[PDB]
Ligand binder design. Structure first.
Ligand SMILES: [Cl-]
Ligand SMILES: [Fe+3]
Length: 349
């Protein structure tokens, strides 16, 4: 049927992560995942009801540590990268012409070295979009001064693998520092200041040799970590983290261990003595008074906020975590889900 496509951006390394999936089979693939964003990217795969077949990595990154290894152990995905990168511990190595499939859709590998000798470009099956990585950026190119990088090879790879793509084809890069999101083949072929227009191989290399950039900060860490594919958490209840950021607690576990946590009920006083009941041992502290009543809460006990549907209780976690509570968890669905799952309620109807 349709393609499902999402662009995520890592503020700390300016990295674009790309999530593709086929709505027919709900099977997905995730391009250039970032280490610090693993709980975030996996949350979004669950809220979309997807299944991550592969994490693909266009090249060994110097700016950021990849999330391929962490995601392979969390949700089961498979570390793909090019064979030319040199990285150890991938489930599938990749070569020019490899068809990576997910559902009825697929991507196509194109070797585009120059940034590194392992850089690849993932073209979409219908060739409406492609993921160049660090080979070709928006009105620019990746740097050619480290990681076996050569500006002659980048120019040959852009004019021969990327500029041969259809004119209207969108080009999604792995980074951008100006707040831009996409560019087409026709734009760069014409307006790229480094190697578009009428520039020749000798015009590009004189631009790069005289482009002097500051090193990335995580270079001494990312490169050895990404050479091993990214190899170098709340343990007081079974906890997940919604894409929205809020931590949620397993209700079934909570029913079994009501004595362990400090259940806090943030509804109005009416609602607590009201028709929906209340979890046994709940503690009425209304949301509009929990700002300046935080001093009434034990540090030696995790806190689990509850409300009607679980919205005002999520806001209670942001309030408790700004007050310095390290163990806090919303109960998803609130009493409406609690009651509709048969769980024990006092003073109901
Ligand atoms: Cl609510
Ligand atoms: Fe790079």
């Amino acid at each position: 049927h349709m393609l499902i496509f999402r662009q995520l951006f890592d503020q700390q390394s300016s990295t674009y992560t790309y999530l593709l999936a086929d709505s027919t089979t709900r099977e997905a693939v995730l391009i250039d995942p970032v280490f610090e964003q693993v709980r975030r990217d996996a949350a979004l795969i669950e809220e979309l009801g997807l299944h991550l077949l592969y994490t693909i990595d266009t090249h060994v990154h110097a700016d950021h540590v990849t999330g391929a290894w962490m995601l392979n152990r969390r949700i089961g995905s498979r570390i793909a990268i090019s064979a030319a990168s040199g990285a150890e511990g991938a489930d599938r190595y990749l070569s020019h012409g490899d068809k990576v499939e997910f559902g009825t859709r697929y991507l196509t590998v194109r070797a585009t070295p120059g940034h590194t000798d392992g850089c690849i470009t993932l073209v979409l099956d219908n060739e409406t979009m492609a993921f160049t990585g660090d080979c070709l950026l928006i009105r620019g190119t990746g740097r050619t001064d480290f990681q076996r990088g050569d500006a002659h090879t980048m120019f040959r790879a852009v004019h021969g693998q990327i500029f041969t793509l259809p004119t209207a084809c969108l080009l999604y890069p792995a980074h951008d520092y100006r707040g831009l999101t996409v560019t087409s083949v026709g734009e760069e072929r014409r307006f790229n200041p480094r190697l578009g227009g009428e520039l020749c191989e000798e015009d590009f290399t004189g631009y790069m040799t005289n482009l002097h950039l500051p090193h990335p900060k995580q270079i001494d860490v990312a490169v050895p970590a990404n050479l091993k594919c990214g190899l170098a958490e709340p343990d007081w209840a079974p906890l997940t983290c919604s894409f929205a950021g809020i931590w949620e607690i397993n209700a079934q576990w909570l029913e079994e261990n009501l004595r362990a946590v400090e259940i806090v009920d943030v509804r109005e006083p009416e609602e607590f003595n009201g028709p929906l009941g209340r979890i046994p041992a709940a503690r009425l502290i209304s949301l509009g008074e929990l700002a300046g009543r935080t001093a009434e809460l034990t540090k030696d006990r995790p806190i689990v906020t509850v409300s009607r549907a679980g919205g005002r209780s999520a806001q209670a976690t942001v309030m408790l975590r700004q007050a310095g509570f390290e163990r806090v968890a919303n109960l998803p669905g609130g009493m409406l889900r609690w009651r509709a799952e048969g769980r024990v309620v006092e003073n109901g109807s």
